[PDB]
Design a protein around this ligand. Structure first.
Ligand SMILES: Nc1ncnc2c1ncn2[C@@H]1O[C@H](COP(=O)(O)OP(=O)(O)NP(=O)(O)O)[C@@H](O)[C@H]1O
Ligand SMILES: Nc1ncnc2c1ncn2[C@@H]1O[C@H](COP(=O)(O)OP(=O)(O)NP(=O)(O)O)[C@@H](O)[C@H]1O
Ligand SMILES: [Cl-]
Ligand SMILES: [Mg+2]
Ligand SMILES: [Mg+2]
Ligand SMILES: [Mg+2]
Ligand SMILES: [Mg+2]
Ligand SMILES: [Mg+2]
Ligand code: NA
Ligand code: NA
Lengths: 389, 389
């Protein structure tokens, strides 16, 4: 592995497709290695743009626009932060010699639930919830009848809970369908049977030159489409951890390429069920910004540059808690910060230029002698922040 | 403490006067809290500029220049990275209501050996080496005479050992007095009595809203005016430590203002001698990038922003080892990096645009079961990096 100096002729150039808070940490980690960084998104002054050498604002879903910026900047690596990208062009570029992280195919499979679900369940034969796809309201109903109640419906091209309904009875059928129609490319939906798990985790898995590595299990708490808190490690039986790792290894290798992946699993005692996977750093993994020697972001960077991971140090019980206000402003301020940080307590404020309703503007991080204590410390701190605008 | 959003009208602005590797990490820490960063230096593309919002290239020794950049950017904080600044303008500006970190007084006193030496030895009655100020070769001559052999001669406005001579014999004196002229402003010096210590430390001391806190002592190895290796924690007697803390506290409290200070001391048995102090993060402190929950850069920011520190966690035996090549190039590359990273091992590459002689281009960071093992690990990794021109 050879790295050049950012801004010099032999520079190593990384292009970030999506410049949110997740990309922001990847940028920092690239910059820490003197890696040249070009941050791209659909809006100006996005978080990652704050710490990049240069930035561009384009239609990331536009394959031509993508090709244009790529031709213009000639990055060595293209690093997507989101699902909503012209994956078809990524494939082209990849063939054209571009390094798409982790790989263009991983990106295509995961931008639509259909690709990923069918691969895991049908091709890989991994355990998953029952599911049915539907592209019409009527077919939607047939699916539900076959799946049974309760069931959850989701748009095939969605994230963060957009257009999702937890269906308990036929009564909600109408609304569920509409709502789901509202979410996406505005068509197709997935109808999944409800898994009743003891708890859920995100197994941060790194595929690198020196193999597949696993971070300690991350537990999380969801609240209406968004993670609210995450913690590590999440206690699990030895058998469950082994099955979890088996599943994650298979999925990442199947998706292919080097990088860190966010493997979402449901745990039922000693049993593990595959949910979905981020072929990149996971929002819940932000706890790793305090709980490990190498964050999930440092890890992704390390893996994709072709460097060996060697190993990951976990410092003990930790948690994250989102700072998720609800307001409309283009000049957000954060007061009472003196009460949100301290011993074994930190915060991150993303620099997002504006908000119009609910938006994750930062995160509180804490360590403690138990996850229970960390979670409370972290929730408390996030809550202390006075968001005004 | 109220923080705005970077790039927004109510943004909180930090101006960095000096954009090297140290400033680079402070910039990252400011960015992590959504603070707006303006990186200033005397050459373009300085490391901190890579991660700043914007930058300026000026002659930091020119007060008018300084005033102009400050007035232009209207920063809420002015943070120096180095001694070589128009501290007089700093004083003025502070008087005008600018916030100079830690305080303008602290900057002035430390940029001149004469101020700090006299303050510590005389004002605070602390243990230091034997010293004397010459202001004529003749006086230089008389002074070396009063101090004896061997002795150290230093410009009173010198760093990185610039313009210093280690004198064991009279013969050197022609040379010695001239060199004390090579470096500095280009004509006053200090003559210090050589201290025969067991080891040298840097006591990273944070002065914040919740008072003064200390990092575990950092030992280090200097060679040719440059630190080579640093490690933590340096083994010391409880008595020794206590005395070191005592000295650090009096000094930081005496200079004033919030921030991280690098207190250089010498240890002989249970005795501690004050050498000097940096009113900002110290190079040797780079080990804190792997050794603590909060790096010296995060500490500096936490403190200057008026937030509480609470506590500092140390993660066991840790070390830093510089990447200090010597060649002339404007397009440096780094090969064999895969052999410089691994478990408990990381490296940083600063992004410096060029080199022409000996220059610090990166640092290796390691953790181990023992300080000794950590040092080997760090040294070995720095040595594996092949620096090409
Ligand atoms: N079949 C299922 N059974 C039980 N709970 C489920 C099921 N599918 C989803 N959930 C729950 O709903 C949450 C969100 O589901 P998910 O499939 O990840 O939506 P998403 O829109 O893809 N969100 P994101 O993680 O941001 O990509 C999960 O994390 C679980 O808490
Ligand atoms: N009186 C002394 N006795 C013994 N060693 C000394 C003495 N003064 C300096 N040294 C050694 O010389 C090194 C550099 O001295 P120093 O006074 O810190 O110079 P400088 O130019 O100000 N360097 P810097 O640390 O970058 O500001 C110290 O770190 C010690 O290892
Ligand atoms: Cl189906
Ligand atoms: Mg998803
Ligand atoms: Mg999510
Ligand atoms: Mg999910
Ligand atoms: Mg000095
Ligand atoms: Mg010194
Ligand atoms: Na920048
Ligand atoms: Na790839």
């Amino acid at each position: 592995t050879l790295l050049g100096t950012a801004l010099r002729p032999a520079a190593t150039r990384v292009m970030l497709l999506g410049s949110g808070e997740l990309g922001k940490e990847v940028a920092i980690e690239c910059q820490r290695l003197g890696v040249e960084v070009i941050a791209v998104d659909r809006y100006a002054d996005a978080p990652a743009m704050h710490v990049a050498h240069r930035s561009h604002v384009i239609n990331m879903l536009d394959g031509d626009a993508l090709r244009r910026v790529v031709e213009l900047e000639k990055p060595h690596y293209i690093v997507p932060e989101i699902e909503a990208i012209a994956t078809d062009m990524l494939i082209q570029l990849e063939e054209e010699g571009l390094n798409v992280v982790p790989c263009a195919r991983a990106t295509k499979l995961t931008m639509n639930r259909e690709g990923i679900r069918r691969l895991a369940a049908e091709e890989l034969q991994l355990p998953t919830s029952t599911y049915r796809f539907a592209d019409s309201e009527s077919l939607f109903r047939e699916a539900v009848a076959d799946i049974g109640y309760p069931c959850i419906v989701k748009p095939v091209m969605s994230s963060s809970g957009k257009g999702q309904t937890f269906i308990r009875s036929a009564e909600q059928l109408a609304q569920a369908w509409k709502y789901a129609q509202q979410g996406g490319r505005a068509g197709r939906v997935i109808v999944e049977g409800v898994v009743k798990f003891d708890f859920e985790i995100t197994l941060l898995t790194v595929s690198a030159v020196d193999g597949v590595h696993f971070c300690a299990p991350v537990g999380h708490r969801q609240e209406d489409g968004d993670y609210r808190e995450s913690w590590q490690p999440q206690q699990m039986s030895p058998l469950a951890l082994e099955r979890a790792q088996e599943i994650a290894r298979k999925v990442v290798l199947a998706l292919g390429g080097y990088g860190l992946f966010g493997v979402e699993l449901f745990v039922c005692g000693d049993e593990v069920i595959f949910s979905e996977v981020s072929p990149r750093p996971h929002d819940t993994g932000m706890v790793t910004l305090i709980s490990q020697d190498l964050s999930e972001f440092a890890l992704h960077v390390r893996a994709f540059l072709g460097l060996p991971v060697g190993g990951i140090r976990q410092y003990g019980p930790a948690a994250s808690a989102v700072i998720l206000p609800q307001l409309t402003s283009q000049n957000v301020t954060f007061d009472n910060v003196q009460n949100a940080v301290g011993a074994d307590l930190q915060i991150r404020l993303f620099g997002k230029p504006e908000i119009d309703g609910s938006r994750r503007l930062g995160v509180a991080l804490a360590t403690a002698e138990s996850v229970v204590d960390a979670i409370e410390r972290a929730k408390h701190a996030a809550g202390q922040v006075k968001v005004q605008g």
